[PDB]
Amino acid sequence: PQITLWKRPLVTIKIGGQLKEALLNTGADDTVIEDMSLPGRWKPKMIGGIGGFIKVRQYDQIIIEIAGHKAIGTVLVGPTPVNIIGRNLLTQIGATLNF
Amino acid sequence: PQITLWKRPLVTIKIGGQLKEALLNTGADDTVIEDMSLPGRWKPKMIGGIGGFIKVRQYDQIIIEIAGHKAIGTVLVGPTPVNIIGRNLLTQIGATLNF
Numbered sequence: 001p002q003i004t005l006w007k008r009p010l011v012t013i014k015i016g017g018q019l020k021e022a023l024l025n026t027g028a029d030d031t032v033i034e035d036m037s038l039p040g041r042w043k044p045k046m047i048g049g050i051g052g053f054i055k056v057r058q059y060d061q062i063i064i065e066i067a068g069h070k071a072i073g074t075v076l077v078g079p080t081p082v083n084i085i086g087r088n089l090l091t092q093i094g095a096t097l098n099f
Numbered sequence: 100p101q102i103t104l105w106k107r108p109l110v111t112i113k114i115g116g117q118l119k120e121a122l123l124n125t126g127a128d129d130t131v132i133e134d135m136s137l138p139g140r141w142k143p144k145m146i147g148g149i150g151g152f153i154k155v156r157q158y159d160q161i162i163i164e165i166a167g168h169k170a171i172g173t174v175l176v177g178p179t180p181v182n183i184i185g186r187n188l189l190t191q192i193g194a195t196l197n198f
């Protein structure tokens with residue numbers, strides 16, 4: 001699709017069998033989702049947002065559907081205001097910015 | 100332009116007579132620029148994301164040139180770690196997400 005930006009670019013994602021909502025986020029390097037159970041091991045990561053740096057759980061090679069497109073990659077789990085799909089997965093679904 | 104998302108989508112902006120580098124940010128309602136002086140009235144605002152909230156100054160009816168395109172709207176100014184062009188100005192230059 002072509003998504004205009006008058007409203008938040010919210011899409012449905014599917015991860016661990018659960019449907020969730022997430023923001024398509026060109027301003028994020030990484031994908032960050034609210035606390036949920038994911039399979040496998042995780043590793044530590046510090047990410048820096050508008051308010052400062054926080055600790056999150058980094059899960060690699062996680063299967064996730066984004067607006068109907070399958071991606072498999074890194075998902076960070078931690079205290080974010082809204083679920084965000086960052087560039088690591090936007091590239092997998094072939095997303096570009098256009099004007 | 101068509102901007103791929105392998106790297107941060109950074110562009111050159113002109114604001115308050117100054118050139119700055121800024122991130123094109125579909126994940127941000129508002130545009131937020133590192134602290135600087137702007138002309139006219141302002142009022143305080145709190146904005147929150149990863150890491151919590153920061154206090155900013157809200158200036159309305161500010162003209163910015165974004166990668167050669169002039170837009171006008173509200174600009175928030177404060178201690179953001181990165182200059183962010185949010186949806187309020189991205190709409191004005193006709194920016195879309197496409198996949």
Ligand SMILES: CC(C)CN(C[C@@H](O)[C@H](Cc1ccccc1)NC(=O)O[C@H]1CO[C@H]2OCC[C@H]21)S(=O)(=O)c1ccc(N)cc1
Pocket residue numbers: 025026027028029030031032047048049050051081082084086124126127128129130131146147148149180181183185
């Ligand atoms: C968290 C989003 C809901 C909102 N944010 C925009 C977001 O794109 C920021 C924009 C941003 C970008 C860089 C630094 C600080 C903030 N990116 C971000 O937090 O990304 C994190 C996840 O991937 C990492 O790569 C960048 C930082 C990490 S935000 O900066 O916090 C924000 C919040 C409120 C307003 N009004 C305007 C902006």
